Amino acid sequence: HMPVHIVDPREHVFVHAITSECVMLACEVDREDAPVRWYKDGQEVEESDFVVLENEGPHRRLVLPATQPSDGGEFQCVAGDECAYFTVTI
C-alpha cells in the first residue's frame, strides 16, 4: 500500500477575495482511501451553518458563501504525508 500524494492542486494557491465574494476551495488526492482535512490557519475547519465541507471520493471542497475578513488566512489541506497551501487575501 502506497501512503498518499495530492494530485491537485500542484502549486502555491493565491486566492484574491472580498467580503461579498464566495471562495470555494478544491483539493483532489491520488487515492480515494486517503481524503484531505481542511485547516483554518492550523485550527482545522469544522462543519458550521455558513462553513460547509463538500466531499466526494478523491475530491475535497471548502465552500464559503460570504468570505469574511475573519476567513482571510491560509488554508492547509492535510492528506498525511503531503499538504497543499491556499493563501486567501480579503
Swiss-Prot record:
Disulfide bonds join C27-C77. Component of the 3M complex, composed of core components CUL7, CCDC8 and OBSL1. Interacts with CCDC8. Interacts with CUL7; the interaction is direct. Interacts with FBXW8. Interacts (via N-terminal Ig-like domain) with TTN/titin (via C-terminal Ig-like domain); the interaction is direct. Widely expressed, with predominant levels found in the heart. The chain holds residues 805 to 892 of 1896 of the full protein. This is Obscurin-like protein 1. Residues 3-90 form the Ig-like domain. Core component of the 3M complex, a complex required to regulate microtubule dynamics and genome integrity. It is unclear how the 3M complex regulates microtubules, it could act by controlling the level of a microtubule stabilizer. Acts as a regulator of the Cul7-RING(FBXW8) ubiquitin-protein ligase, playing a critical role in the ubiquitin ligase pathway that regulates Golgi morphogenesis and dendrite patterning in brain. Required to localize CUL7 to the Golgi apparatus in neurons. It is linked to 3M syndrome 2: An autosomal recessive disorder characterized by severe pre- and postnatal growth retardation, facial dysmorphism, large head circumference, and normal intelligence and endocrine function. Skeletal changes include long slender tubular bones and tall vertebral bodies. Signal peptide: none annotated. It is found in: Cytoplasm; Cytoplasm, Cytoskeleton, Microtubule organizing center, Centrosome; Cytoplasm, Perinuclear region; Golgi apparatus.
